[PDB]
Design a binder for these strands. Structure first.
Ligand SMILES: [Ca+2]
Ligand SMILES: [Ca+2]
Lengths: 152, 152
DNA sequence: TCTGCCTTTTTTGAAGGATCCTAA
DNA sequence: TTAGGATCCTTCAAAAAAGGCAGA
């Protein structure tokens, strides 16, 4: 558990509320127990000319990585434990994405029990739905109702 | 002056570096002495469903206003004196738009003596050029060299 | 099985301007 | 003339997903 300084988290929270994204997904997958799995991603996007800003963020957060997608680059953090540690410390300072971060934390904490009960899995999938509802969601396909249908 | 608190300025600088814009323009208009005027705008854009965020900004900055543009809204500050007071305080905390902020402050400081000679109006115009260079400029038309219709 | 990373796509929600109006 | 506001336009630079591979 890296501890992050407060002035860093305040500025970063403003920047995340603006250019960042807290993304929760349900992905069909026949080899997982309930034929789906959850993905949680913290992302900060920026034009590739300013990839230096994202490279410095990776140094400061101490985990995650930067990838180029031609025109733009993204800082990505997905690994569950460091994602939990990071969002736990950022969320107090968030204003537009606070609810999404707290949902992600709730999901992460219930993950252990999600993976042994289909109705607990479903409940967690409804929290994913709530995240997407708070985001500017436009291309989403798999929802908790997709999961419920498939569970037979 | 209105003296802003530190935690407000940290968060806002991150938000501004993300969704904000520090804009300097040279507008052609035959009724100004030099056939142009300088226009300086601090802008924060957000989707209109989140216009309450921008309304709150008016209250916290204590000047400026919010304009609905249909799909998105903008907080706008361009009145020269409060703009100068606000950017002076925000500038230290900016990381992507710090130079643009300092150019606007520099221009503002010279405006008075700008409206009193060619050569020095043109000089200020090159400082506008430099802010546009720092921005992701894509639709700019009137530059300092356009202003060389001051040539007679 | 489970997780984290890789690749790619969609559609804006921003950014960064240009131009027009009007009082004092 | 001037400052500040009002209307508008362009072109992305973001956001927010989708789908897939493979090592553990
Ligand atoms: Ca944004
Ligand atoms: Ca941005």
């Amino acid at each position: 558990n890296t501890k992050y300084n407060k002035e860093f988290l305040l500025y970063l929270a403003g920047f995340v509320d603006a250019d960042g994204s807290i993304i929760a997904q349900i992905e069909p997958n026949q080899s997982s127990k309930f034929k789906h799995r959850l993905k949680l991603t913290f992302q900060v996007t920026q034009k590739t000319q300013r990839r230096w800003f994202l490279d410095k963020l990776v140094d400061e957060i101490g985990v995650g990585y930067v990838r180029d997608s031609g025109s733009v680059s993204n800082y990505i953090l997905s690994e569950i434990k460091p994602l939990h540690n990071f969002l736990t410390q950022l969320q107090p300072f968030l204003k537009l994405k606070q609810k999404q971060a707290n949902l992600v934390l709730k999901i992460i904490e219930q993950l252990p029990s999600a993976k042994e009960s289909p109705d607990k899995f479903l409940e967690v999938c409804t929290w994913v739905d709530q995240i997407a509802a708070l985001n500017d969601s436009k291309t989403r396909k798999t929802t908790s109702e997709t999961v419920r249908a498939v569970l037979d």
